[PDB]
Amino acid sequence: SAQVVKEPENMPKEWNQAYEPFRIAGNLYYVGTYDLASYLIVTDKGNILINTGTAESFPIIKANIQKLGFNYKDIKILLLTQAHYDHTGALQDFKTETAAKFYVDKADVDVLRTGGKSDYEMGKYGVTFKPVTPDKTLKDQDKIKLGNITLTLLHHPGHTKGSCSFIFETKDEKRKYRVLIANMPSVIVDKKFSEVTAYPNIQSDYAYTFGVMKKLDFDIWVASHASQFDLHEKRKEGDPYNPQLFMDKQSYFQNLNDLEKSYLNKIKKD
Ligand SMILES: [Cl-]
Ligand SMILES: [Cl-]
Ligand SMILES: [Cl-]
Ligand SMILES: [Cl-]
Ligand SMILES: [Cl-]
Ligand SMILES: [Cl-]
Ligand SMILES: [Zn+2]
Ligand SMILES: [Zn+2]
């Protein structure tokens, strides 16, 4: 007896498509699929994994972790940028196989415990991912620590009630890098924000998100989807360690402003 999990029919090819893992900057590695970004932070006292792709991304991420010479059984903490099946699908698979602790934005708790049923938009699909129970809940500016690595949760709602970004420093032999793992504030609802009675604070949430995201200071930026930070335009698989590819700060602000431009254009319809 188990509530049936079913991902939407007709998912994009690039989501389950394999991508060769690489070193982003310092102790940050990309272990995701072609489009579904999954981040690995390697520490002295264990590993952190941010985002997991769909259900079928589980063997891929596990294989990518091994390819870089790391052990997925050493993942001590699991983190999320948004509570959608395309970033949560392998979360339960990881939690059971590794006995890692799962920390999430307080606002996304119900979506995770119900495997998508409570999502203001994704709920229409029922259970899109294996439900998971967080070991801890996080609020804006909360610190996650493992070894010398310290991550700060930045509450960036709208895309999901508890979508968030992470900001941390990492270092290589050369320098230190203030890394931002962004959850770009896009709009998934086709109807007026006033109609979205499931998410009462949707409009105000995005409005805050645009404000706070324009005032961030970082050296390197990446996002939930590869296409958002133009990964495949910047590099081809096999390309050597090059953090400067992800130092295109002006592109983060241009994409952010394009998202605010369409956000405001949506709200004028009232
Ligand atoms: Cl069922
Ligand atoms: Cl129910
Ligand atoms: Cl809609
Ligand atoms: Cl409302
Ligand atoms: Cl707020
Ligand atoms: Cl791209
Ligand atoms: Zn999403
Ligand atoms: Zn997504």
Descriptors for this entry?
5-stranded mixed beta sheet, binds zinc ion, 12 strands, alpha/beta, 7-stranded mixed beta sheet, 270 residues
Helix-strand blueprint:
Blueprint: H1 13-16, E1 22-25, E2 28-30, E3 39-43, E4 46-50, H2 57-67, E5 75-79, H3 85-88, H4 91-98, E6 101-105, H5 109-113, E7 136-138, E8 143-146, E9 149-155, E10 164-171, E11 176-182, H6 202-214, E12 220-223, H7 231-234, H8 249-267
Parallel strand pairs: 4-5, 5-6, 6-7, 11-12
Antiparallel strand pairs: 1-2, 2-3, 3-4, 8-9, 9-10, 10-11
Explained architecture:
The protein is of the alpha/beta class. It is globular and about 50 Å long. The protein has a 7-stranded mixed sheet with strand order 1-2-3-4-5-6-7, covered by helices on one side. Strands 8-9-10-11-12 form a 5-stranded mixed sheet, with no helix packed on it. The protein has one domain: 4-Layer Sandwich (Metallo-beta-lactamase, Chain A). Helix 6 (202-214) packs antiparallel against helix 8. The chain has helices at 13-16, 57-67, 85-88, 91-98, 109-113, 202-214, 231-234, 249-267; strands spanning 22-25, 28-30, 39-43, 46-50, 75-79, 101-105, 136-138, 143-146, 149-155, 164-171, 176-182, 220-223. It binds chloride ion (6 copies) and zinc ion (2 copies). The site of one chloride ion has 3 residues, from loops. This is Class B carbapenemase GOB-18.
